[PDB]
Amino acid sequence: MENFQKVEKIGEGTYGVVYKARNKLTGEVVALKKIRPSTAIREISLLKELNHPNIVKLLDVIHTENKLYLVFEFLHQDLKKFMDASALTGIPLPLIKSYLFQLLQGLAFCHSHRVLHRDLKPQNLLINTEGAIKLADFGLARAFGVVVTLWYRAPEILLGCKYYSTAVDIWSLGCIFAEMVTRRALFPGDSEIDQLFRIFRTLGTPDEVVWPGVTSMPDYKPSFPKWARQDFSKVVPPLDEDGRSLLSQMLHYDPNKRISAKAALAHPFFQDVTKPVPHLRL
Numbered sequence: 695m696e697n698f699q700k701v702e703k704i705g706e707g708t709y710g711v712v713y714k715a716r717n718k719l720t721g722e723v724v725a726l727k728k729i730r731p732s733t734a735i736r737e738i739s740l741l742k743e744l745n746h747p748n749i750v751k752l753l754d755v756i757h758t759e760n761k762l763y764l765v766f767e768f769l770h771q772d773l774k775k776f777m778d779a780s781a782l783t784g785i786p787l788p789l790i791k792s793y794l795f796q797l798l799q800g801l802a803f804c805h806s807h808r809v810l811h812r813d814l815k816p817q818n819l820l821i822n823t824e825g826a827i828k829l830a831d832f833g834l835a836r837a838f839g840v841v842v843t844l845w846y847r848a849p850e851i852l853l854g855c856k857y858y859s860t861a862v863d864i865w866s867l868g869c870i871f872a873e874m875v876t877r878r879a880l881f882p883g884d885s886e887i888d889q890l891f892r893i894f895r896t897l898g899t900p901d902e903v904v905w906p907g908v909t910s911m912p913d914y915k916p917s918f919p920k921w922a923r924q925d926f927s928k929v930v931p932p933l934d935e936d937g938r939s940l941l942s943q944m945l946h947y948d949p950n951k952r953i954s955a956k957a958a959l960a961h962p963f964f965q966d967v968t969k970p971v972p973h974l975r976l
């Protein structure tokens with residue numbers, strides 16, 4: 695309140711309440727995030743340096759009265775709400791393609807700077823009236839270190855691996871891509887084991903052939919049921935073969951086999967990519 699004017703609470707984020715606020719000095723409207731450690735302050739502050747058209751800008755890190763706040767650029771809609779609003783007709787393919795392309799650019803940028811997100815989901819993908827889509831919260835997970843949605847969690851995380859790689863973000867993005875296409879979450883698990891088994895029932899229970907080292911993951915149990923992989927054309931109909939091919943590469947079990955954001959940008963699926971204007975009701 696000393697330095698801002700609260701417009702309204704807009705949601706509950708991973709780390710605390712998020713408000714739409716107005717900077718007292720500048721009059722600018724921002725997304726103010728209250729964080730519910732000195733190591734973190736220094737680390738997060740470095741994120742202020744990230745600047746890319748597809749990344750929500752971290753405007754400032756404020757540490758006052760022994761409270762921590764992160765100030766982010768404000769956008770008017772998120773992908774979760776946009777998908778809900780578009781459920782009757784579906785998001786036009788050209789726009790799904792444009793959003794996926796832009797999201798991969800944001801990931802390629804962050805990953806090139808050694809910054810992972812680790813918790814990508816429709817709620818932290820923000821859109822504006824000009825057709826841009828941006829990712830918010832990259833790098834917070836590493837700096838802070840932990841009802842939460844498990845729908846977009848990579849299998850290695852669900853299997854208890856405590857070492858993350860850029861591949862966890864590609865997995866989440868693949869799940870989001872599938873959801874934009876079918877208008878339904880790909881793997882809507884209600885628990886970690888349900889999340890894992892939903893993945894197994896669709897992509898097949900992983901083994902040492904497709905994922906070397908999987909049987910040695912922390913939470914892997916030899917007792918996991920063995921489900922056969924489903925035909926991929928049944929998972930995201932009516933997406934064409936270019937889209938299905940790209941999606942399959944984003945959903946490989948072995949994180950090391952998962953396509954990189956950079957390589958994905960070159961996939962044939964983006965041969966005819968454009969930047970359409972979305973119809974946003976604000």
Ligand SMILES: Nc1nc(NC2CCCCC2)sc1C(=O)c1cccc([N+](=O)[O-])c1
Binds near residue numbers: 713771820830
């Ligand atoms: N920058 C930014 N602009 C936002 N405007 C809202 C978009 C949805 C409609 C209301 C305004 S939301 C936001 C976040 O960064 C954000 C990410 C994860 C979660 C939340 N959250 O509130 O729970 C917020």
